[PDB]
Amino acid sequence: TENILRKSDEEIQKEITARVKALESMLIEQGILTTSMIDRMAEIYENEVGPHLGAKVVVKAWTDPEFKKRLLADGTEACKELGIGGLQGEDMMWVENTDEVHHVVVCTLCACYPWPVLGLPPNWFKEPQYRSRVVREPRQLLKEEFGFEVPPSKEIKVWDSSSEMRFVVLPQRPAGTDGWSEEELATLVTRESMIGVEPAKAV
Amino acid sequence: TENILRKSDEEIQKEITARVKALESMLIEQGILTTSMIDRMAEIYENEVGPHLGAKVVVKAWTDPEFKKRLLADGTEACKELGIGGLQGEDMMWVENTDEVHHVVVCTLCACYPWPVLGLPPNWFKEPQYRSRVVREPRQLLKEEFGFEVPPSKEIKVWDSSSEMRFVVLPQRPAGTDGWSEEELATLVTRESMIGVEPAKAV
Amino acid sequence: MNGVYDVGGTDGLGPINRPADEPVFRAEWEKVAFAMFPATFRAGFMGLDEFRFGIEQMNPAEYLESPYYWHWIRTYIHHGVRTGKIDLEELERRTQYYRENPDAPLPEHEQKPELIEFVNQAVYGGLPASREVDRPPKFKEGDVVRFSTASPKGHARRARYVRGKTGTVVKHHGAYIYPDTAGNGLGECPEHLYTVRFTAQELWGPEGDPNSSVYYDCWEPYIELVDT
Amino acid sequence: MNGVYDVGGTDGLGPINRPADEPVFRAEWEKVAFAMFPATFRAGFMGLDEFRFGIEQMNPAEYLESPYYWHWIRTYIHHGVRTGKIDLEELERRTQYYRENPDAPLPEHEQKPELIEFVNQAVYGGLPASREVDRPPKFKEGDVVRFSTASPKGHARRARYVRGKTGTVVKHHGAYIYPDTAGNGLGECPEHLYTVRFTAQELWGPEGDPNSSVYYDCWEPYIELVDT
């Protein structure tokens, strides 16, 4: 929104940069931070951990009802079967979209998010507009923001992750995908669909 | 507080000025606003209506128990006796500080204030720091901000004026003022003392 | 609405900034913003409740740190465009003119005695909000009441720290203009007004002072009976 | 605390800004702020709950409109000074150096394999917060519970929109690090954790959807029994 008090995005970024570099130099001189330590964290979450990991679970549950049971009973343990887990998904609870229930996930208090299956959250998930409104007007918010129309008779359950428990939506498998390979089905699974803000891709 | 996002006070004032002048020019061309209309509003609240008006009521109640009764029963009517009243004090309720009760006044939702006896509020009364804290920690707030120590055993009643009713504190008359003239007593009555944030002046 | 302006009970806003003294108007522009209130009121831009709602729809970071009277400018523009009395593109073009020509003159205009008459009448007579109603008050002093949990998106005076809380009626004041209709363009629809007392422990849990109370004004539909 | 960060149910924050796509890290400084988390954690600047509390004490207007990872920088500095590990005057002097010499080199330093070992271990093994306790859970699925009305000034996970509200326990999760002690430097003091379901009409009054519910995680002391 417009704030007549607010510097330019350029002036903001330039100030932040000098401040981070100054703080970085002090932590370097303390011995607690290195360049290689910064690269490795950034490589992990740019190219290693991402929502492709979550899609693999989803298409496994879509195609393996016994795995789907184990996923919904203990999400951390089930994801461990595929070599998926770790920081910020140490406690995962997966919740299944049905014909009667739609699930959407938020962290109203900060920005918590299941890193091992979705990677770092997009900026809109961390910001005050989504976080403030989704607990209050989920049905209107899904239609206006994401064009996702949930019929008035279907229940919407909003999960506000206030603890270290991490909620992840298991989206409903799209109609018309009978017999699809796991690879082919994964193309339909999106970050948005495992947050609850969109269904899986159609067709 | 520091906000790395915030322009200079100079850059802010210069932008506000251009915007107000532009808006002013449009309202002038509409016929609804004039220079003399701006001067008159500003003269009234710079030099005509001010907290000196409230002090006159206070010293009247301090020295006239029957007036004090009428003030506490209907504040608008009582102030009308002294030729005091009007915009933003059309409904005044005066509340008496005692040995057992201390009163403090706030408008948590905006900035409402009894103009006909106090004039326009100081900036600290309109701002978020006073408004947010006084309803929550009045005793700590009066000591830290105003050096005003209310003993733990004395009750503090905070009046959040959410309606057009305007609350004004009647401060306790300072000890040592027996037989003082009304003029002399008024020197002890302050804006702060009729908000509840300070007692009347000592000595 | 549940806007940031509803700051009662908020933490972390910082210490009170209070100069040892300060002028009524800190700059010429402030006199202007101030005098623009009676001017837009008489022209039908808005009333008191509507005025407050415009400020409540401000960007929250700007509201929190801008000069107070800048809030007034925002609400003026809000209702100017709302009613169609203020054309934004013109306004923006003129702002850039006065950015670049800060000493340019204002439009030529005639002085209007009725606008002084208006000012004086309003300052000394007031704009009283009390109204007469055909219905008697529902409640009375000593009644234990509970504050509504409704969370309207439009204007109302339902501070979030009092909702769903229980207090005792302290005084009935008569009937007054009702913010929840007035502030939303829906007329006065006057309602009885009461002060209600809430203990700090009712408000803040164990973190409240055990010897302190908050007094809050409630229009009749805000409160329902607990005990008579 | 009752800080602005606790935004659930707030109105007037504006529409969601959502580019059609965006990179993980929008600028080099963001990679740095990010990697500084494991670095200060291992050095004992703070833990997870304490980290979040530093962000919660930010100036509210800045919090609301600054880049996300700038929040992280603030909390780093917060606990750096808190523990005495960060000398502010040095930090300010160096900031002005890098303002004026943005391409100057960083301090010479040796690479440390144990810090890579640390990173990898934390990313793939995690930092699990679950704990074992000698006490059994107080509550169980189907229990109707009421959320505490306490309003602590320190860190806790007591969103203001759920306080004093009634819901049904949905699942007990085991015992976990307790924010209200951990975030305030007072140790793990683990407590049983439960999800609790609150209908939207319980939360928002009549303005709530009649076919919608909010699920919220509560540590045992947050909730007391209404019905078993």
Side-chain angles (χ1 to χ4, degrees):
Chain A
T1 279
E2 181 183 273
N3 181 354
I4 66 156
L5 315 176
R6 197 173 67 235
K7 298 164 156 213
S8 68
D9 289 335
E10 283 122 357
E11 278 317 294
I12 290 171
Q13 289 295 312
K14 177 277 154 152
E15 181 60 27
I16 293 175
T17 296
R19 296 203 176 222
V20 171
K21 193 164 186 178
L23 179 58
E24 183 184 5
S25 69
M26 294 184 72
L27 303 188
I28 286 176
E29 287 182 347
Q30 289 177 29
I32 71 164
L33 182 68
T34 65
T35 51
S36 60
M37 209 198 165
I38 295 168
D39 288 350
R40 181 60 191 141
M41 285 292 285
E43 142 175 80
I44 293 172
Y45 293 91
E46 281 187 329
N47 315 301
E48 298 178 23
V49 178
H52 61 283
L53 297 178
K56 295 166 64 163
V57 180
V58 172
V59 302
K60 190 185 179 65
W62 278 355
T63 60
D64 188 338
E66 284 305 290
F67 174 73
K68 182 176 177 176
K69 218 198 181 263
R70 300 196 295 284
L71 180 65
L72 301 174
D74 192 311
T76 294
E77 314 296 359
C79 291
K80 260 133 173 202
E81 297 181 34
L82 294 83
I84 300 174
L87 194 58
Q88 282 300 288
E90 301 88 352
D91 293 271
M92 278 184 298
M93 188 165 153
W94 288 67
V95 294
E96 182 192 357
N97 279 349
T98 67
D99 294 340
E100 301 68 53
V101 179
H102 186 75
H103 303 276
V104 67
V105 186
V106 64
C107 188
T108 68
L109 296 167
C110 46
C112 62
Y113 195 81
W115 294 359
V117 290
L118 299 182
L120 304 180
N123 279 293
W124 63 265
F125 182 92
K126 301 182 282 191
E127 287 160 9
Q129 294 67 40
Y130 172 74
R131 287 163 49 214
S132 68
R133 189 185 186 203
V134 73
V135 290
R136 183 157 160 71
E137 295 167 328
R139 209 173 303 272
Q140 300 96 312
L141 185 154
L142 291 185
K143 183 174 127 123
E144 295 160 14
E145 187 44 41
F146 299 90
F148 185 27
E149 200 190 77
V150 183
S153 57
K154 189 166 185 176
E155 182 183 8
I156 301 175
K157 294 180 182 296
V158 182
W159 299 76
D160 191 358
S161 73
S162 52
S163 79
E164 286 309 287
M165 186 64 42
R166 294 284 166 268
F167 308 107
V168 197
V169 179
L170 174 57
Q172 275 189 289
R173 181 175 176 164
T177 59
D178 303 332
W180 282 27
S181 64
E182 282 179 88
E183 172 128 335
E184 289 185 350
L185 286 168
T187 68
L188 308 179
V189 188
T190 61
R191 207 216 262 281
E192 290 68 27
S193 72
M194 304 172 260
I195 295 175
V197 294
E198 287 176 4
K201 281 166 200 122
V203 177
Chain B
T1 279
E2 181 183 273
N3 181 353
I4 66 156
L5 315 176
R6 197 173 67 235
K7 298 164 156 213
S8 68
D9 289 335
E10 283 122 357
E11 278 317 294
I12 290 171
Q13 289 295 312
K14 177 277 154 152
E15 181 60 27
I16 293 175
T17 296
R19 296 203 176 222
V20 171
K21 193 164 186 178
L23 179 58
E24 183 184 5
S25 69
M26 294 184 72
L27 303 188
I28 286 176
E29 287 182 347
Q30 289 177 29
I32 71 164
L33 182 68
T34 65
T35 52
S36 60
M37 209 198 165
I38 295 168
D39 288 350
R40 181 60 191 141
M41 285 292 285
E43 142 175 80
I44 293 172
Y45 293 91
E46 281 187 329
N47 315 301
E48 298 178 23
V49 178
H52 61 283
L53 297 178
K56 295 166 64 163
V57 180
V58 172
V59 302
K60 190 185 179 65
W62 278 355
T63 60
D64 188 338
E66 284 305 290
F67 174 73
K68 182 176 177 176
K69 218 198 181 263
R70 300 196 295 284
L71 180 65
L72 301 174
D74 192 311
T76 294
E77 314 296 359
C79 291
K80 260 133 173 202
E81 297 181 34
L82 294 83
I84 300 174
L87 194 58
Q88 282 300 288
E90 301 88 352
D91 293 271
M92 278 184 298
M93 188 165 153
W94 288 67
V95 294
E96 182 192 357
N97 279 349
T98 67
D99 294 340
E100 301 68 53
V101 179
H102 186 75
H103 303 276
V104 67
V105 186
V106 64
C107 188
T108 68
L109 296 167
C110 46
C112 62
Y113 195 81
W115 294 359
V117 290
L118 299 182
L120 304 180
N123 279 293
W124 63 265
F125 182 92
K126 301 182 282 191
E127 287 160 9
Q129 294 67 40
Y130 172 74
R131 287 163 49 214
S132 68
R133 189 185 186 203
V134 73
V135 290
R136 183 157 160 71
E137 295 167 328
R139 209 173 303 272
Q140 300 96 312
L141 185 154
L142 291 185
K143 183 174 127 123
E144 295 160 14
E145 187 44 41
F146 299 90
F148 185 27
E149 200 190 77
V150 183
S153 57
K154 189 166 185 176
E155 182 183 8
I156 301 175
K157 294 180 182 296
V158 182
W159 299 76
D160 191 358
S161 73
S162 52
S163 79
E164 286 309 287
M165 186 64 42
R166 294 284 166 268
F167 308 107
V168 197
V169 179
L170 174 57
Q172 275 189 289
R173 181 175 176 164
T177 59
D178 303 332
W180 282 27
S181 64
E182 282 179 88
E183 172 128 335
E184 289 185 350
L185 286 168
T187 68
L188 308 179
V189 188
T190 61
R191 207 216 262 281
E192 290 68 27
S193 72
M194 304 172 260
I195 295 175
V197 294
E198 287 176 4
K201 281 166 200 122
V203 177
Chain C
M1 53 150 36
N2 295 354
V4 173
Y5 75 91
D6 171 18
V7 304
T10 293
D11 292 327
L13 304 196
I16 295 173
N17 178 34
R18 181 172 67 99
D21 202 22
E22 64 185 50
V24 175
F25 297 110
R26 303 179 288 185
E28 284 307 287
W29 76 261
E30 292 195 351
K31 300 183 183 178
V32 180
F34 181 66
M36 268 185 183
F37 194 111
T40 60
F41 179 93
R42 190 181 197 266
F45 277 50
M46 83 280 214
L48 182 54
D49 307 81
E50 286 164 316
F51 172 91
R52 301 190 166 113
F53 192 35
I55 297 177
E56 298 164 357
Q57 297 171 77
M58 263 186 77
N59 163 341
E62 191 186 85
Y63 170 83
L64 291 170
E65 298 191 325
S66 63
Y68 176 80
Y69 283 112
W70 175 249
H71 306 180
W72 293 28
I73 302 299
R74 281 297 196 192
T75 201
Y76 294 151
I77 297 170
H78 173 88
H79 293 291
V81 176
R82 179 186 70 82
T83 61
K85 295 175 199 283
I86 292 294
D87 187 279
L88 261 189
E89 284 64 44
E90 181 58 12
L91 179 56
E92 288 171 8
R93 187 194 69 82
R94 298 201 173 189
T95 299
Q96 180 72 3
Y97 179 71
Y98 283 121
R99 283 191 192 103
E100 298 169 345
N101 309 276
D103 298 332
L106 289 167
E108 302 278 27
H109 66 283
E110 68 157 5
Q111 303 309 307
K112 280 168 180 193
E114 56 265 33
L115 299 186
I116 304 304
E117 292 158 31
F118 188 81
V119 162
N120 285 337
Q121 201 282 318
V123 167
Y124 288 113
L127 196 83
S130 57
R131 298 287 186 272
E132 289 251 65
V133 294
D134 291 314
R135 81 192 63 100
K138 196 165 172 201
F139 307 105
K140 67 178 190 297
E141 298 185 18
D143 285 355
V144 175
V145 293
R146 172 161 155 110
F147 199 98
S148 172
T149 57
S151 57
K153 289 287 288 153
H155 183 67
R157 307 292 276 177
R158 304 164 177 259
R160 271 169 307 170
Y161 80 91
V162 301
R163 298 190 195 165
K165 302 285 174 193
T166 300
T168 304
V169 175
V170 174
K171 192 171 192 341
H172 166 242
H173 301 287
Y176 289 79
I177 291 180
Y178 185 40
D180 304 40
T181 53
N184 296 296
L186 300 169
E188 297 183 350
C189 310
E191 291 277 343
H192 287 293
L193 187 70
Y194 309 88
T195 292
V196 177
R197 165 193 208 181
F198 301 91
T199 69
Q201 318 276 59
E202 172 67 16
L203 298 177
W204 317 113
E207 282 79 4
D209 187 299
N211 198 202
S212 176
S213 283
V214 178
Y215 290 67
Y216 188 101
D217 287 359
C218 314
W219 284 261
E220 198 161 87
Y222 288 9
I223 50 170
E224 89 152 354
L225 196 64
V226 176
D227 296 310
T228 201
Chain D
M1 53 150 36
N2 295 354
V4 173
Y5 75 91
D6 171 18
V7 304
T10 293
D11 292 327
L13 304 196
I16 295 173
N17 178 34
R18 181 172 67 99
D21 202 22
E22 64 185 50
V24 175
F25 297 110
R26 303 179 288 185
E28 284 307 287
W29 76 261
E30 292 195 351
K31 300 183 183 178
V32 180
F34 181 66
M36 268 185 183
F37 194 111
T40 60
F41 179 93
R42 190 181 197 266
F45 277 50
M46 83 280 214
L48 182 54
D49 307 81
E50 286 164 316
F51 172 91
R52 301 190 166 113
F53 192 35
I55 297 177
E56 298 164 357
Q57 297 171 77
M58 263 186 77
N59 163 341
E62 191 186 85
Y63 170 83
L64 291 170
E65 298 191 325
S66 63
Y68 176 80
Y69 283 112
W70 175 249
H71 306 180
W72 293 28
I73 302 299
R74 281 297 196 192
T75 201
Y76 294 151
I77 297 170
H78 173 88
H79 293 291
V81 176
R82 179 186 70 82
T83 61
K85 295 175 199 283
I86 292 294
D87 187 279
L88 261 189
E89 284 64 44
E90 181 57 12
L91 179 56
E92 288 171 8
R93 187 194 69 82
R94 298 202 173 189
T95 299
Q96 180 72 3
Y97 179 71
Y98 283 121
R99 283 191 192 103
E100 298 169 345
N101 309 276
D103 298 332
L106 289 167
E108 302 278 27
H109 66 283
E110 68 157 5
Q111 303 309 307
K112 280 168 180 193
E114 56 265 33
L115 299 186
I116 304 304
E117 292 158 31
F118 188 81
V119 162
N120 285 337
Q121 201 282 318
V123 167
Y124 288 113
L127 196 83
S130 57
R131 298 287 186 272
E132 289 251 65
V133 294
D134 291 314
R135 81 192 63 100
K138 196 165 172 201
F139 307 105
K140 67 178 190 297
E141 298 185 18
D143 285 355
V144 175
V145 293
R146 172 161 155 110
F147 199 98
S148 172
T149 57
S151 57
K153 289 287 288 153
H155 183 67
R157 307 292 276 177
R158 304 164 177 259
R160 271 169 307 170
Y161 80 91
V162 301
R163 298 190 195 165
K165 302 285 174 193
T166 300
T168 304
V169 175
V170 174
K171 192 171 192 341
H172 166 242
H173 301 287
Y176 289 79
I177 291 180
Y178 185 40
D180 304 40
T181 53
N184 296 296
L186 300 169
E188 297 183 350
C189 310
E191 291 277 343
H192 287 293
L193 187 70
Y194 309 88
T195 292
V196 177
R197 165 193 208 181
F198 301 91
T199 69
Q201 318 276 59
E202 172 67 16
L203 298 177
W204 317 113
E207 282 79 4
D209 187 299
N211 198 202
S212 176
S213 283
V214 178
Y215 290 67
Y216 188 101
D217 287 359
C218 314
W219 284 261
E220 198 161 87
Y222 288 9
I223 50 170
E224 89 152 354
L225 196 64
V226 176
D227 296 310
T228 201

